[PDB]
Amino acid sequence: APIPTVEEKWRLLPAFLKVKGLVKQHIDSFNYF
Amino acid sequence: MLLFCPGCGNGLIVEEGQRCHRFSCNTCPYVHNITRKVTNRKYPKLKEVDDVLGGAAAWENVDSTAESCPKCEHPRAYFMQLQTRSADEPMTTFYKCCNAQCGHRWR
Amino acid sequence: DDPVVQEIDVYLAKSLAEKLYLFQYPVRPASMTYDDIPHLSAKIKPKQQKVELEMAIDTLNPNYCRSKGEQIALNVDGACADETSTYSSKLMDKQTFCSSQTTSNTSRYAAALYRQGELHLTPLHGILQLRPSFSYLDKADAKHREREAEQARQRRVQSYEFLQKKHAEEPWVHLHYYGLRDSRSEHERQYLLCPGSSGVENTELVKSPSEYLMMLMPPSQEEEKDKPVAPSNVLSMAQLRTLPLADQIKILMKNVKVMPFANLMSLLGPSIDSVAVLRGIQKVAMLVQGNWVVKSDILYPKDSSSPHSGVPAEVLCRGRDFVMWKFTQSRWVVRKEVATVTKLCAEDVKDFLEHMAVVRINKGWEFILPYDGEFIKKHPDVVQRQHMLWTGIQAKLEKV
Amino acid sequence: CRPYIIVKKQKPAVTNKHMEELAQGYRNFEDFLHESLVEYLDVNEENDC
Amino acid sequence: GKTPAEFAKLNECPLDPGGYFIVKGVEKVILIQEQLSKNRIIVEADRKGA
Ligand SMILES: [Zn+2]
């Protein structure tokens, strides 16, 4: 039987990109220091 | 196998100074007198015996039965086999064949 | 899995709370019991607890090699001085051990005595490890060697001989030994059993499993250096206790613009009063077509300005007030050219309607969610209170 | 580290309802973390699963 | 924390990534550095095979 699909999975990515992700490493490290 | 002294916990040594050999310590007078025989060694070490009898050596080891090749089956290679390393590991077999201008030696 | 058998009880004996020690010999097998050989002498110190033990050894039996014993004696003790010889005879009369500490605190360790139908515990006062003492070679070395022949910042706290001196301050105490063969041992062993009724309800251990979980696991931070003002996105799903229910409501409304009433109770939970929340809802959200919608000023405070990537301008909440007035007047809005009356730039129109509505091909914009039965809930008064509040707002709004 | 969705007994932890909630805006990424729906794996730890 | 409207008065681009320094009026970036762990038992064979 075909397992049910969660079509919207990919929407977890934009939220992650909002709170963390690209070019946030330098900002977070400098803030912490 | 190794031994340590019950009294002091260091390694024993073997020596003779009286009618009978003795297992003794080097720091305390504890000793045991060996009256019997123990049967386990440290597996000593001497290197590869290859050319003990290299080349067309004596003919006492001749034997009757032999195998044959799958391709050509010419009349000259009688059997031989050999060993790997030590007293507690297997022994191997190789079928090497050699007339000219090739490279054969089957495992 | 029901309890099957041997549902035995447990008991605590305080008779020996400070009197109990556990002694372990790493260097000797468990089968090689020490009980047989006669013990001779021992020493103890109460603080920085350590002990020394002196042990008889047979010299006549064959396994003692007498000659080497005599050589060791001559090497370790004076030839004929013998005033303070380590041995009374000219051979090894005895051998000694040294103790070692294992841990500072031992609270979480308890000895136990099992018995048919009962089991008795006892707190341990300390654990120590014993090892054979090799100081006698050092004594022999010393005897051979004697036969041969504005102060800077203190650092003595870290030097070993300071600890030796600290430990030397403590006087020695000696103790009379009694072996397992002595009936005195069974006499002492009587004290482990504690008397009392077999069935008693313990007064202590009152804490419930709930209390025990955070008891053994205290909060990581005893006090946080900052307060959860929650201006930005936070943990909306967990109803923060420190956040007042009116502030919670304001945060949900800030986070998300339009929902039916039933969601409020779905998210706040049945524990929250369904009536009291009306006061906050009326303070912060108005119902349109039966569905509550947030205020414009909450989303665009008068201090703020046009944030979007279009044209900067004063914070015209009235533009939002226009689109919601239209949506109260009609189910859907086909008026593509609101900018003619609002006079605002186009991106404002798409931005406001993106908040409020959904695009329909060749039919402008329509309500994002269906009509709801606003009279199912028994509040006709607030429905009317919205009706003439918006009538007055519209009358004021007509001016532009 | 990387985030992954957690699977138990062959059914994912996350379900369309959650994605609907997230899209509408009830909750946010960090919410999925407390509720044990996603977790951060690390190179030494993703060697095990 | 500024909005797009306010950036323009500052002569800055909204889409700019940020995360870099300005020293003597030139844009400097500190690159991420990679190195092996500390405090581990590494087992290895010498150049002679030992
Ligand atoms: Zn010894």
What are the counts of helices (DSSP H) followed by strands (DSSP E) for chain B?
0, 5
Q: Is the dihedral of CA C90, C93, C97, C98 positive or negative?
A: negative
Interchain contact C230–D (C-beta under 8 A):
no
C188: Cα separation from own chain's centroid: 41
- Other CB atoms within 10 Å distance of the CB of residue C18: 8
Q: What CATH number corresponds to the domain at position B76?
A: 2.20.25.10
Contact B85, B43 (CB under 8 A): no
Q: Which two tokens stand for residue D32?
A: 């999925």
Contact E14 C308 (CB under 8 A): no
Residues 6+ apart with CB under 8 A from A25: E32
List, as ranges, residues 255-294 from C with C-beta within 8 Å of D: 255-256, 267
With tokens 């969705």, the residue in question is: D5
Nearest chain D Cα to A9, which residue?
D19
Q: Which two tokens stand for residue B27?
A: 């720091």
Residue E47 assigned ligand-binding role = yes
CB < 8 Å to C256, chain D: 24-26
CA distances from C121 to C8, C12, C16 (A): 13, 5, 10
- The span from the CA of C212 to the CA of A4, in Å, is 41
Phi, psi of C211 (to 5 degrees): -60, -35
Q: What method was applied to determine this entry? A: cryo-EM
- The span from the CA of B67 to the CA of B81, in Å, is 13
- The span from the CA of B6 to the CA of C27, in Å, is 9
CA distances from C172 to C47, C48, C57, C95 (A): 11, 12, 24, 19
- Rounded to the nearest angstrom, the minimum Cα separation between D30 and chain C is 7
DSSP letter string, E24-46 = TTEEE---------SS-------
Radius of gyration over alpha carbons of chain A, in Å?
16
- The span from the CA of B80 to the CA of C106, in Å, is 69
Q: Chains touching chain E at 3 or more Cβ pairs under 8 angstroms? A: A, C
Radius of gyration over alpha carbons of chain B, in Å?
26
Full residue range of the structural domain in which residue B101 is found: 56-107
Q: Which two tokens stand for residue E50?
A: 């030992």
Interchain contact C351–E (C-beta under 8 A):
no
Contact B27 C64 (CB under 8 A): no
**A6, A13, A18: which to substitute to probe chain D, counting the most D Cβ within 10 Å?**
A6
CB < 8 Å to B28, chain C: 72, 92, 95
C-alpha dihedral, C76 to C80 to C86 to C92, nearest 10°: 70
- CA angle B14-B17-B23, nearest 5°? 25
Which of D12, D14, D22 has its CB closest to that of A15? D22
Alpha carbon of B12 to ligand 1 centroid (Å): 9
CB < 8 Å to E30, chain A: 26
Contact C66 B29 (CB under 8 A): yes
Contact C305, E5 (CB under 8 A): yes
Nearest chain B Cα to C66, which residue?
B29
**Residue A26 identity (one-letter amino acid):** H
Return the axis-axis angle of helices C317-329 and C380-397, rounded to nearest 10°: 120
Resolution (A): 3.4
**CA neighbours closer than 13 Å in the CB half-sphere of residue C144:** 11
Contact C57, C69 (CB under 8 A): no
Alpha carbon of C164 to ligand 1 centroid (Å): 27
- Locate breaks in chain C with C to N over 2.5 A; list the residue preceding each: 149
- CA angle B4-B10-B16, nearest 5°? 75
- Rounded to the nearest angstrom, the minimum Cα separation between E12 and chain C is 13
Which conformational region is residue C11 in: left (phi greater than 0), alpha (psi within -120 to 50 degrees), or beta? beta
- The span from the CA of C367 to the CA of C23, in Å, is 82
CA distances from D27 to B27, B50, C231, D19 (A): 76, 78, 15, 9
